[PDB]
Design an enzyme around this catalytic site. Structure first.
Site, PDB file in Angstrom:
ATOM      1  CG  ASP A 152     -13.832  -1.559 103.818  1.00 33.45           C
ATOM      2  OD1 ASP A 152     -14.692  -1.031 102.845  1.00 33.45           O
ATOM      3  OD2 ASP A 152     -12.454  -1.448 103.818  1.00 33.45           O
ATOM      4  CD  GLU A 185     -14.439  -4.385  94.902  1.00 34.11           C
ATOM      5  OE1 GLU A 185     -14.377  -3.258  94.235  1.00 34.11           O
ATOM      6  OE2 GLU A 185     -14.571  -4.204  96.004  1.00 34.11           O
ATOM      7  NE  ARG A 216     -10.450  -1.853  93.753  1.00 33.92           N
ATOM      8  CZ  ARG A 216     -10.877  -1.532  94.682  1.00 33.92           C
ATOM      9  NH1 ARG A 216     -12.279  -1.481  94.862  1.00 33.92           N
ATOM     10  NH2 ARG A 216     -10.184  -0.820  95.638  1.00 33.92           N
ATOM     11  NE  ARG A 244     -12.588   4.688  95.235  1.00 36.88           N
ATOM     12  CZ  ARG A 244     -12.962   3.786  96.165  1.00 36.88           C
ATOM     13  NH1 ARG A 244     -13.899   3.709  96.994  1.00 36.88           N
ATOM     14  NH2 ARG A 244     -12.359   2.518  95.943  1.00 36.88           N
TER      15      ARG A 244
HETATM   16  C1  LIG Z   1      -9.684  -4.383  96.719  1.00 36.23           C
HETATM   17  C2  LIG Z   1     -11.200  -4.635  96.747  1.00 36.23           C
HETATM   18  C3  LIG Z   1     -11.522  -5.152  97.984  1.00 36.23           C
HETATM   19  C4  LIG Z   1     -10.657  -6.180  98.500  1.00 36.23           C
HETATM   20  C5  LIG Z   1     -10.411  -6.429  99.897  1.00 36.23           C
HETATM   21  O1  LIG Z   1     -11.809  -4.224  99.076  1.00 36.23           O
HETATM   22  C6  LIG Z   1     -12.894  -3.462  99.114  1.00 36.23           C
HETATM   23  C7  LIG Z   1     -12.732  -1.835  98.691  1.00 36.23           C
HETATM   24  C8  LIG Z   1     -13.771  -1.225  99.032  1.00 36.23           C
HETATM   25  C9  LIG Z   1     -13.474   0.131  98.444  1.00 36.23           C
HETATM   26  O2  LIG Z   1     -14.151   1.140  98.761  1.00 36.23           O
HETATM   27  O3  LIG Z   1     -12.394   0.300  97.797  1.00 36.23           O
HETATM   28  C10 LIG Z   1     -14.925  -1.621  99.570  1.00 36.23           C
HETATM   29  C11 LIG Z   1     -15.128  -2.819  99.808  1.00 36.23           C
HETATM   30  N1  LIG Z   1     -16.067  -3.091 101.223  1.00 36.23           N
HETATM   31  C12 LIG Z   1     -17.076  -3.732 101.287  1.00 36.23           C
HETATM   32  N2  LIG Z   1     -17.252  -4.754 100.447  1.00 36.23           N
HETATM   33  N3  LIG Z   1     -17.643  -4.017 102.634  1.00 36.23           N
HETATM   34  C13 LIG Z   1     -14.066  -3.645 100.228  1.00 36.23           C
HETATM   35  N4  LIG Z   1     -14.546  -5.007 100.444  1.00 36.23           N
HETATM   36  C14 LIG Z   1     -14.504  -5.934 101.169  1.00 36.23           C
HETATM   37  C15 LIG Z   1     -14.865  -7.203 101.248  1.00 36.23           C
HETATM   38  O4  LIG Z   1     -13.975  -5.230 102.491  1.00 36.23           O
END
Ligand SMILES: CCC(CC)O[C@@H]1CC(C(=O)O)=C[C@H](NC(=N)N)[C@H]1NC(C)=O
Ligand SMILES: CCC(CC)O[C@@H]1CC(C(=O)O)=C[C@H](NC(=N)N)[C@H]1NC(C)=O
Ligand SMILES: CCC(CC)O[C@@H]1CC(C(=O)O)=C[C@H](NC(=N)N)[C@H]1NC(C)=O
Ligand SMILES: CCC(CC)O[C@@H]1CC(C(=O)O)=C[C@H](NC(=N)N)[C@H]1NC(C)=O
Ligand SMILES: [Ca+2]
Ligand SMILES: [Ca+2]
Ligand SMILES: [Ca+2]
Ligand SMILES: [Ca+2]
Lengths: 389, 389, 389, 389
Positions: free
Chosen positions: B69, B196, B211, B288
């Site tokens: 991520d 988000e 969410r 998904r």
């Molecule tokens: C619960 C949503 C957030 C909270 C840390 O995580 C994101 C979840 C996600 C996914 O596929 O479910 C992808 C996102 N990745 C990125 N934005 N790079 C997650 N967000 C973060 C900031 O790690």
């Protein structure tokens, strides 16, 4: 109407990331130039990333021996800040193996030094068309900042160098107007040595923190008025910001003379913040690895080594290299001062690594009104490449 | 002159395709970034596709572990809506592993959150130049919409989050003017959880469907006035639009509290249409895969589960993922209202598929005055790639 | 201010080359889209090449089965006339497997028909943003010109089709203003069949020479007034310009009815020049090979087969295919009339050749006041490609 | 408002580099066109590099037999000066295997000659849209400058040729206005031979130094007034500037007649500087290797061989080829005269080298007020390529 650039440098508490191009990681499959000495400069409308190409591309055989400094194939090009030095977004700028570029509010001025070592020519471009020319006055690798030159009220100021890279050389100041040379000056610095300055505007004057490749592990400082009267010296602070350098303890500091005893060096920067200084340096003391910036209270005017702020940008497990200064135009940021920004070059390949090539990517950071958490926006390329195999 | 964005959201009967980039299929030979979390936003002159790069390219070794991520190499870039996130048409935006971007009628504002988990910095860019900064207030992955922020009469509103991804966290509202932070607010949502958000304008107010990554399979709703007084709750409708979620029968619905018992989630959107709601969800209940949008009569204000319209965009044999909201400027469509549009992210690769990489492509759809036939504008990439072999 | 396009079509004696993109030859190493049905259209400032992508690239595995006509991945994009349909200069236009596009003096209008066969939606874009929508009225492959639509004094006219590809179908005329549908009309053509018209302006009216895929080897003609009253028929001339077609001797000709007995067809064009006609056809009578254009004296109004001028553009050893019409804006050429121009699609690959793919490149030609020597501006790609091996 | 171009050619003492594209070195991995005959021309806003493509790319199989001069696939395109003739920054210009292009202050005029040898057509483009046409008047390879045409006060002047490449041919002057041919003239030059002129403006007149492919090793000179009365002859200077040519000693010189006895040749240039001349030539006398420029005192009007200045640009170990002239608009340089600039084509591949292809890269140089040190801005590609293997 010109971009006056007459304000004071803001006082900032920390630095936030502006950009990161991932040039080398992308160049593993992308069509990215092999390049060295990148730098940033801005106009009232955009900030661009200048760089010196090796007239070839990553992962290609022509990237062999790209450790070489000067070549007939090296050209100055530019892209948008944060973009990769790719072929397909690149603006040709000048034929150059040493360069500087900067905007005057109306048009880009770029200087590109090329030719043979003993008689190099510096081609002055303004608006993407050669306008003037400076020949080597001392016959030994005529060179320049390798970072943004500086424009104040329509005139553009920069520093060149001719002479040995290991002993006394000769350094000058040049000033142009719309590509035309209207002034120059000899800098009297006996026992001193000035390479690859990193300059910026500040109260209508050009402040520069340079590189001593002779004997100083402290950085020569230079403050240029528009009339080309200058003040030359060393960064007072009791902390050494060159590489190679000694420990911070076995170092004294001088406002005037070079201290340190080790030779060599690397391009670097510093911003004045009244009497203090944000100074830039690699984390390692003997290698081009890691990068942090320090705020020394009263460090601009004293031999002080008092640190009130500190911020790591590249960790000491990761390669870095060059770093330089620039400023955001008041027309861009909206502030009533000039936002200090810097970039760090992150060298990969030879001589440190397992390649036939040398290249680098970059990260840009900008002064903000808060402290920023330490981290490592490291290069991230996985070496060697396919070409190395 | 600003883009006032003060109108009502149109009432639409169905959605026609705006765009489809084929980013992954093209990336099998093309020079396309490995990316995640793409989204769309518009100016009075163009709609762009923002995305988070993995600082590398499809079919290249640096695409390994792209399931991760957050990384130092992840950057926010942009292209024209419908274009592929290629290198050669990309605008650098911000260093970011979580982001939001939106136009104020005069210039693009973009926010890019990067840095270390425990002390992330959010760099606010306006006009492609850093202007402000938000530090992590709660010390646990400071993040943001991962979709268009919202600008009304010159001020730009967006929602951030700091804290656990599995329990109570902390969420705020930020408001800026020309890149400058002029306001913020704490959202009081005990027992609730907001990640988000997907926001849009509607009667001069910011409507957001978010969410819940804690316990709700229903989506938290939030309606923000310009003074930063807010109304926080859940999407009333008796139909769950998160994934994982239960059947539509064994679900009740609440305007106020989280329902469902399963945790986890995925980013998604919804538009109000008076008392009704167009709500977005994946076809699968536990994976998904697939994508459809539903119109629930009185669903915005009641626990209703009355469907008057329905439209499948991705079939349940094909992968999808994220989806978010944006609007066409009145200056673009010509309407006397704001045309609701959405995008669906179509994830390919890990964890579901036979690769070392994870990436995604997109499709964009826009509200029209008619019902649109169901179909599947699916991703269409053939996995694994050469790099996987 | 609109581009009025009200003038008469110039009387030209011959055709000079405008452009040639070498799209397929370049795609052997370049990053070029696999595409079909390209066409040209112009604004007061540029002429662009529109095309339907196969959402993939030449020399890549996703180019397999690109003989298929309709797919969820097919998109309308555009480049500058003469440029190759490459990724890196492409503008996204619409999701489409059948399309038309044209400029109104202020903005590009594009129509993109996509979706499922039995319920296709045509998304009307104006200025790169969806504005209107036309659903399939007859439930059988809703389609359109596959060439430039036509704009006169701010309103844009084009022809669609719904129904069988082998028997009677249904055809309409659509008229829009700034992306908004303000009119439509049913064309009464019993015993007739109209596919993929090639239209142009002429005395403030829309003249179209179409394709009969039912029984005619002669081309249906249609002249549309702005009030959507029309005149429908066949190209009078005693020469057949479809493929497959019979010899020129065993053919009669009709102003009214389809002649020929063979079915099938190919898209093509014709320009009126008073009572005469420049008519376009392949050299082969049964295959899509070669291309020439003929001037038939009185051919627009009589069953004449009198040739006064002739010009070969593609020789009968080389593949061709589609061809269509467009005009240079008076604001571009400077003339006091509308310069007739055409393009020829040059199909390579399946079904005729040794590949897994089908694609095509193009040549554009423009009416000049002189006779032009015959030649062959052929495609020139060497098949099969690496992907085929 | 037009770009009047009425001034005198500056008197320059030496030449500084403008640009260098590294087109071939980059094409080893990059997507660069295989091309020949590049040249430069400028507008009040940019200088561009025109070139003839081989409708294919370096390192690709379609680059085979690229030694061929004329082909149906050869097109005129353009990029920014210094950029590589890549696909992704290229503007389509005209279908051409012989060309010229130049700006009139308002729009680019380009001429592209293509078609069959015995009946070639020259398509005149103005503003990227065909406007006029010149048919072959003598039926034997109608051709043109292969360098910048010349625009003075809104009218554009250039020279064409039709006839044998080995004996007497026929040459004309063409003059156009906004793409329209408004004048032409026959040049009476019995015993003379004019190919591929290199022209520039000078006191409101067109000065051209051409190529004699018949018997002269001296270059035919031509000075064209706006009324199309001309002065035709040979470059007076007692030094031969063609290749192949004899020694400088066994040569006399003539203002009027061809001298030398060897046939063949190469395109080249010269600038008048009052009575003197800067003349361009390869270093080798019999091969296309090396490049230098000489200043002959009184050489424009006398058979003088007095050299006051000399400058080597390509060393005689490295390949060169074509070279031609152009000028910087007064609107660009700021001077009160027209800055003389030239380019050198650097051919690589067949017939001299170990390839299946022939291509070339370029260097551009511009007149400055100082002497410039000799050097070699050589091509630098490492042959053969992967395709050759
Ligand atoms: C619960 C949503 C957030 C909270 C840390 O995580 C994101 C979840 C996600 C996914 O596929 O479910 C992808 C996102 N990745 C990125 N934005 N790079 C997650 N967000 C973060 C900031 O790690
Ligand atoms: C002491 C700094 C200069 C003086 C010759 O050398 C530069 C050192 C350098 C480095 O990595 O340390 C890189 C530069 N290379 C290029 N600019 N191409 C050196 N500068 C020059 C002009 O060779
Ligand atoms: C009879 C012409 C139409 C009617 C369905 O078919 C098109 C025929 C065709 C061809 O090569 O002959 C190509 C077109 N393909 C696409 N536009 N994608 C056919 N048109 C459609 C809409 O399938
Ligand atoms: C004598 C110069 C012309 C007359 C036919 O020939 C050109 C010679 C040439 C060379 O390398 O010497 C290259 C040119 N090729 C192209 N322009 N494509 C020749 N010109 C033509 C029109 O064939
Ligand atoms: Ca040092
Ligand atoms: Ca959930
Ligand atoms: Ca037919
Ligand atoms: Ca000769």
């Amino acid at each position: 109407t010109y971009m006056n650039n007459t304000e004071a440098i803001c006082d900032v508490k920390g630095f936030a990331p502006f950009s990161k191009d991932n040039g080398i990681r992308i160049g593993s499959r992308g069509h990215i130039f092999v390049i060295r000495e990148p730098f940033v400069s801005c106009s009232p409308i955009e900030c661009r990333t200048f760089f010196l190409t090796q007239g070839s591309l990553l992962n290609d055989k022509h990237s062999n021996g790209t450790v070489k400094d000067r070549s007939p194939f090296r050209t100055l090009m530019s892209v948008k800040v944060g973009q990769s030095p790719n072929v397909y977004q690149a603006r040709f700028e000048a034929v150059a193996w040493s360069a500087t570029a900067c905007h005057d509010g109306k048009k880009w001025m770029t200087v590109g030094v090329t030719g043979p070592d003993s008689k190099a020519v510096a081609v002055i471009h303004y608006g993407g068309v050669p306008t003037d020319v400076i020949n080597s006055w001392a016959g030994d690798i005529l060179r320049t900042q390798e970072s943004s030159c500086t424009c104040i009220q329509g005139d553009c100021y920069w520093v060149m160098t001719d002479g040995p890279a290991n002993r006394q050389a000769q350094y000058r100041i040049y000033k142009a107007n719309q590509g035309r040379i209207i002034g120059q000056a000899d800098i009297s610095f006996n026992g001193g040595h000035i390479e690859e300055c990193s300059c910026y505007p500040n109260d209508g004057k050009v402040e520069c923190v340079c590189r001593d490749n002779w004997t100083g592990t402290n950085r020569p400082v230079l403050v240029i008025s528009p009339d080309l009267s200058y003040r030359v010296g060393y960064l007072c602070a009791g902390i050494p910001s060159d590489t190679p350098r000694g420990e911070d303890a076995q170092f004294t500091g001088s406002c005037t003379s070079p201290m340190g005893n080790q030779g060599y060096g690397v391009k670097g920067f510093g911003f004045r913040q009244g009497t203090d200084v944000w100074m830039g340096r690699t984390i390692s003391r003997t290698s081009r690895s890691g990068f942090e910036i320090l705020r020394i209270k009263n460090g601009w005017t004293q031999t002080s080594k008092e640190q009130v702020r500190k911020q790591v940008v590249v960790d000491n497990l990761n390669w870095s290299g060059y770093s330089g200064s620039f400023t955001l135009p008041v027309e861009l940021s909206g502030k009533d001062c000039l936002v200090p920004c810097f970039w760090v070059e992150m060298i990969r390949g030879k001589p440190e690594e397992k390649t036939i090539w040398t290249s680098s990517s970059s990260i840009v950071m900008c002064g903000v009104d808060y402290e920023i958490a330490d981290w490592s926006w490291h290069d991230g390329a996985i070496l060697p490449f396919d070409i190395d195999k």
